[PDB]
Amino acid sequence: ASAKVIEVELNDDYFNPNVITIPINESTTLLLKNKGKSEHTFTIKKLGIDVVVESGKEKNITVKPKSAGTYELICRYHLLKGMEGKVIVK
Amino acid sequence: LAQPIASAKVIEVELNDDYFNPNVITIPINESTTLLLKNKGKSEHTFTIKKLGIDVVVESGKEKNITVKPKSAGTYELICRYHLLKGMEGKVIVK
Ligand SMILES: [Zn+2]
Ligand SMILES: [Zn+2]
Ligand SMILES: [Zn+2]
Ligand SMILES: [Zn+2]
Ligand SMILES: [Zn+2]
Known about the structure:
The first copy, chain A, is mainly beta and about 90 residues long. Chain A has strands at about 5-10, 15, 20, 30-35, 40-45, 50-55, 60-65, 70-75, 85-90.
């Protein structure tokens, strides 16, 4: 099991990277860094993830997906401006 | 006590990406004013006046009414909680 923390930048108004891959049946720590001037969310509904991150702040979350597939990542505030991504569990 | 339906005056406030229009509104103390909040932007926004205990979230392309009856004169900060740092703020003057 990797000690690697997966880092995701939230900026105005996009995720970087906008595709991430995490291992099935393992705990992965994600470091969510909001480098933008707006509040953003990191939301993966089908994985039960919904995190709000203040501008200039970061949060760690731990995810342990049990089903392989490609899951929708969105920011709830900016979905219509293209702030979405794909989270691949394999 | 009875009055006709929708007697309170209505002030429209536009929420767009990322500003309020108008960004200064004046409302009478100890009277009810209705605020019609219209989100004309592509982002979710809030209409938040912390010192008046107001916090309304409006989804893109939607609208919401809120009626307020402030008890103290002053100038209150209006913000969008998501975009305050992008300049999305205003002033609510109660007099
Ligand atoms: Zn966002
Ligand atoms: Zn998608
Ligand atoms: Zn925004
Ligand atoms: Zn806003
Ligand atoms: Zn101000």
